[PDB]
């Protein structure tokens, strides 16, 4: 054939990949502490002899969007929201250290703090709270525990949440949705990120997802139009080859 | 066997028919959840390579093998499915629909081109027999 | 299941579940000692197609 069909076909398939990314972002429009994935087409030119006429296209996800989302006021002392450019630290699935923005902190029957089922990492390893005690979280992450039955004079600090500062260019979303330091950024900032004393959290507010609707809509419209365009070419090439095959006759 | 160009073009026709069959099978089973063994349907692909064993560089086309794609299978969340794993995820085929449609059309076009080649070669061989009346 | 009709179906189902939770909260306003429900969502495993 004329491999021009293999260019428009790639452009049509990567458009479906982009649509699958955008639809995934739209599905998580209500996920607490969600970071939308950025999608971008990139052109790769095929190198070789003769007129460099073929340039294929391949989707690309250049990190995520770090713009803070909405702050819903839920009058719950455990739901916290982070200052912009801030991250909470939890223990990842494989016993590693991961970063998140979901402040929906839950207390188990044994007293351990968890986020989405992952243990919360305190100044010194996971945080264990006295069993069945009221928890208040300060602006700088200090945790006060009140034991029921005892007077409010008993309120004393227990542990401090680890709050780190990381930009978009330094973190990469792992396969389980937890952000981790990129290789270059890890090599310069060390393996574990030191807690920043300047980070401020807000107790009683939960951060929503930063999925922008207007950009999503525009992206879907553009993707549909591009797919239809590539499909026109895929039809042009087909007919042209169908007719060109006649020269092989007589 | 098939003389020369006859063998070459017949090999090409058979290989392109196999490729189109693979594409049609992939298109049909793009939404299959399971197979007889309980494993997800993995997209199949043919392997084209030349067959010029008796000291030649060009000899036509033959399909060495049919191979299943290694592109990550699509995970869908479904905890009630008997085939779901520990996390509740079910594996679904990695078929590229647009890719298989383009494969169907391209296979048809090159199959037709080889048909035109074989027909022309027959014509020429038919005229040859009338060399000098 | 073209990987874009499944992803959006999942979002539609999630929004329907959230609406069911909201309707349950609103219907049980007059009950005694009722604690309101809140729906929490999490994204599933992201698939990596090609490494950076």
């Amino acid at each position: 054939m004329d491999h021009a069909i293999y260019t428009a076909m790639g452009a049509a398939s990567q458009t479906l990949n982009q649509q699958a990314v955008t639809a995934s972002n739209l599905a998580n429009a209500s996920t607490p502490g969600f970071r939308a994935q950025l999608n971008a087409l990139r052109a790769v030119p095929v190198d070789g002899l003769s007129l460099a006429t073929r340039t294929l296209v391949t989707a690309s996800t250049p990190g995520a969007d770090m713009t803070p989302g909405q702050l819903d006021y839920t009058s719950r002392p455990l739901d916290v929201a982070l200052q912009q450019d801030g991250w909470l630290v939890v223990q990842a699935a494989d016993g590693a250290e991961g970063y998140t923005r979901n402040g929906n902190i839950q207390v188990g029957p044994t007293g351990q703090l968890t986020i989405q089922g992952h243990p919360v990492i305190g100044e010194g390893g996971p945080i264990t709270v006295p069993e069945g005690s009221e928890i208040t979280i300060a602006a700088d992450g200090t945790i006060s525990a009140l034991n029921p039955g005892d007077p409010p004079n008993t309120v004393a600090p227990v542990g401090r949440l680890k709050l780190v500062k990381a930009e978009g260019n330094e973190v990469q979303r792992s396969d389980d949705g937890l952000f981790r330091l990129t290789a270059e950024a890890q090599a310069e900032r060390g393996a574990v990120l030191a807690a920043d004393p300047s980070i401020r959290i807000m107790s009683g507010v939960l951060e929503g997802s930063n999925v922008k609707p207007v950009e999503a809509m525009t992206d879907m419209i553009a993707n549909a139009r591009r797919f239809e365009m590539q499909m026109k070419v895929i039809t042009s090439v087909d007919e042209n080859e169908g007719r060109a095959n006649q020269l092989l006759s007589m | 066997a098939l003389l020369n160009i006859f063998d070459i073009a017949g090999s090409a026709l058979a290989a392109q028919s196999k490729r189109l069959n693979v594409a049609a099978s992939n298109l049909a089973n793009a939404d299959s959840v399971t197979g007889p063994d309980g494993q997800p349907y993995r997209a199949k692909q043919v392997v084209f390579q030349v067959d010029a064993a008796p000291g030649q560089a060009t000899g036509g086309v033959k399909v060495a093998s049919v191979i299943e794609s290694q592109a990550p299978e699509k995970l869908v969340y479904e905890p009630g499915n008997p085939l779901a794993d520990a996390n509740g995820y079910v594996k679904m085929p990695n078929v590229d629909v647009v890719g298989e449609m383009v494969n169907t059309m391209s296979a048809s076009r090159s199959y037709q081109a080889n048909i035109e080649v074989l027909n022309t070669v027959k014509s020429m061989m038919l005229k040859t027999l009338t060399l000098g009346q | 299941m073209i990987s874009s009709l499944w992803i959006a179906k999942t979002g539609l189902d999630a929004q329907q579940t959230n609406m069911d939770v909201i309707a349950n909260n609103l219907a049980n306003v007059s009950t005694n000692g009722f604690k309101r429900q809140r729906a929490v969502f999490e994204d599933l495993l992201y698939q990596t197609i090609r490494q950076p």
Binding site: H3, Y6, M9, G10, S13, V44, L56, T58 | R19, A23, Q45, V46, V47, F48, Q49, V50, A64, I67, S69, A71, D96, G99, E100, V102, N103, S106 | R50, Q51
Partner: peptide, 16 residues
């Protein structure tokens, strides 16, 4: 000498 003739060889891939 050859490979998959179609979609799986005409798409960009990371190197090995």
């Amino acid at each position: 000498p050859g490979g998959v003739p179609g979609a799986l060889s005409n798409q960009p891939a990371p190197p090995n």
